[PDB]
């Protein structure tokens, strides 16, 4: 029963098509709960889960103002980064940031996070000590020096240990009937012949939350890691997730294979076979 709060910032320049777009979304575990888009007709931080709606106007005003400010600061940061890499004003670039806090079952801070990426590649990250930085290159070393001068690590540590955890605990209580509820997978095994020689056994997991899940095929109790096709866990659109794992088996040998399912919502891990 550990939990996390994470914010995801994306800023993207588009020369000739206006000023860089700024997007911010917030999550608790795998549940999105706020969003902001600087391209909206009237940009505001807006609710995306029922349990956040109860927050009062001073909350929504604070989060809107921070995000409107960030829209401008991320435009400055994108100009700076273009300079740091001697890039032309003609090209499009992306700046991403993700930060947040993890807590354990007792609500104590397990560790905090703040990382930044430029055009998809790691740029600067706050170290686990919440007091030092790891810069990817000599461009990020400029950012690090700026941030050391402004004592940013100090402020991050205070946020990550203080309000980040306190508001996450508050969200966890306000949304407890969903945020603190693990829904187990609905499972089954399907059989798809390929030829007279082989067939596919596919193990399905549906409707589960949170997304963390382990789905493995075994042949005589040995794992088929290199032989299993795992699809990426995907959202159903109703808060829950889906996944499948498949293995090609020699026809007639289907009963040597077991599918194994681990999920927090499950009282016990499951073992499944094809049932013709």
């Amino acid at each position: 029963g550990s939990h996390s709060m994470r914010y995801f910032y994306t800023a993207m320049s588009r020369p000739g098509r206006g000023e860089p777009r700024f997007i911010a979304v917030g999550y608790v575990d795998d549940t999105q709960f706020v969003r902001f888009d600087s391209d909206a007709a009237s940009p505001r931080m807006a609710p995306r889960a029922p349990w956040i709606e109860q927050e009062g106007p001073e909350y929504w005003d604070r989060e809107t103002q921070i995000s409107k400010t960030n829209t401008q600061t991320y435009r400055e940061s994108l100009r700076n980064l273009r300079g740091y890499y001697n890039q032309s004003e003609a090209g499009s670039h992306t700046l991403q940031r993700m930060y947040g806090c993890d807590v354990g079952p007792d609500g104590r801070l397990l560790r905090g996070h703040d990382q930044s990426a430029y055009d998809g590649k790691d740029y600067i990250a706050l170290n686990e000590d919440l007091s030092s930085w790891t810069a990817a290159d000599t461009a990020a070393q400029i950012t690090q020096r700026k941030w050391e001068a402004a004592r940013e690590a100090e402020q991050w540590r205070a946020y990550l240990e203080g309000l980040c955890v306190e508001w996450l605990r508050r969200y966890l209580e306000n949304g407890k009937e969903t945020l603190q509820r693990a829904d187990p997978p609905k499972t089954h095994v399907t059989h798809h012949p390929i030829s007279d020689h082989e067939a596919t056994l596919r193990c399905w997991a549906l409707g589960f939350y949170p997304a963390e899940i382990t789905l493995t095929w075994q042949r005589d109790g040995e794992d088929q890691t290199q032989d299993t096709e795992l699809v990426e866990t995907r959202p159903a659109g109703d808060r829950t997730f889906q996944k499948w794992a498949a293995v090609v088996v020699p026809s007639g040998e289907e009963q040597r294979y077991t599918c194994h399912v681990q999920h927090e919502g499950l009282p016990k891990p499951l073992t499944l076979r094809w049932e013709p």
Binding site: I66, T73, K146, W147, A150
Partner: peptide, 9 residues
């Protein structure tokens, strides 16, 4: 609850 707006990169 967002982190306060901070310094540009």
């Amino acid at each position: 609850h967002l982190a306060s707006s901070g310094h540009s990169l």
